[PDB]
Amino acid sequence: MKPSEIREMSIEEIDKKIRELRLELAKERGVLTMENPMVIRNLRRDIARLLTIKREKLRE
Amino acid sequence: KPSYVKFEVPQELAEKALEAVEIARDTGRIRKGTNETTKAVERGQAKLVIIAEDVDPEEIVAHLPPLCEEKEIPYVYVPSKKELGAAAGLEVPAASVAIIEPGKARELVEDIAMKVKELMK
């Protein structure tokens, strides 16, 4: 999940991926109350990447 | 009724003054502006002077009546600056004009001179 791949795609796919990632994050934070404690961090930063690059595109 | 106004002037004589100004603009010579009119009266190249009645402040034209009485030159009044400037051929008003070398306007000039002389006296 890197800009190399992200910048190869279109905008609709990016928004869809953001959506599914946010749902994943909510579910993982739900279970965290009750392995691999870095899933949340990596999800957050993937979301940030996607938004940054989508904005680069929609600005140019 | 500002105080530099020394006598009343009928609409007829005012119209005649404006028409003389327009005719002499076309053909003869015209000095537009209070500074130029004052220079003309001080030198002695002016036949008829036209003042406006709606000038504020008064300090701008209040010297012309006495200066013209001294230099024995005739002057008349008109009620608006916009019309005076429009007949002088300008896109701006004018508080005073002087006609010089009237061409095809001597008729009106002489008539206005006599009328305004008997009006002052």
Binding site: - | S3, T34, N35, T38, K39, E42, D56, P57, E58, E59, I60, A62, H63
Partner: protein
């Protein structure tokens, strides 16, 4: 022409047609606000010597101030007898300068150039003030006045840079007697004026 005659009419208003004009004008002015904008100057030659052009960016204002001096408030703590006085004090700024500062308070985007006296009553004096808009291109394009769009020229009237402030600071003198006024009053421990 047309300026010498105004000068001569205004050099003494009692000996001219100006006294009566002024009495009537003041009857009306007494009814107007303390700071009022006007369309044209009253003393055109006076305006044109101090700096005034028929251009966009020049504003003329008339200001009314009360005559006389000042009265100090009543000291509440104890004072020695040389520090008790209340009634016989005079301002160190001139009424002209005070009037310019009033106009500047009312017009917060302009700068004062100069001012001139235009009338006197038993209770009131009148001054006309020339202002300039330093953000207008017609002004930025005129070298006679383009300096005023600099960074060290805002607050002129408040720091003392108009002719009235120069005069009340004491900078029209030179040589014997002017030892304590330059380069500033603060530079000499306030001992000038």
């Amino acid at each position: 022409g047309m300026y010498k005659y105004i000068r001569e009419a205004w050099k003494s208003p009692k000996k001219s047609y100006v006294g009566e004009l002024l009495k009537k004008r003041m009857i009306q002015w007494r009814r107007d606000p303390v700071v009022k904008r006007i369309e044209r100057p009253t003393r055109l030659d006076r305006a044109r010597s101090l700096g005034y052009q028929a251009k966009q960016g020049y504003v003329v204002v008339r200001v009314r101030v009360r005559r006389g001096g000042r009265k100090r408030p009543r000291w509440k703590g104890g004072r020695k007898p040389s520090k008790m006085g209340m009634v016989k004090y005079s301002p160190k700024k001139s009424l002209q300068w005070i009037a310019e500062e009033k106009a500047a308070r009312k017009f917060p985007n302009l700068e004062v150039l100069n001012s001139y006296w235009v009338g006197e009553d038993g209770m009131y004096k009148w001054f006309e003030v020339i202002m300039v808009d330093p953000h207008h291109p017609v002004i930025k394009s005129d070298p006679k006045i383009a300096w005023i769009a600099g960074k060290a020229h805002k607050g002129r009237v408040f720091r003392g840079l108009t002719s009235a402030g120069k005069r009340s600071r004491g900078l029209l003198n030179k040589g014997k007697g002017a030892e304590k006024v330059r380069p500033s009053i603060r530079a000499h421990q306030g001992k000038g004026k």
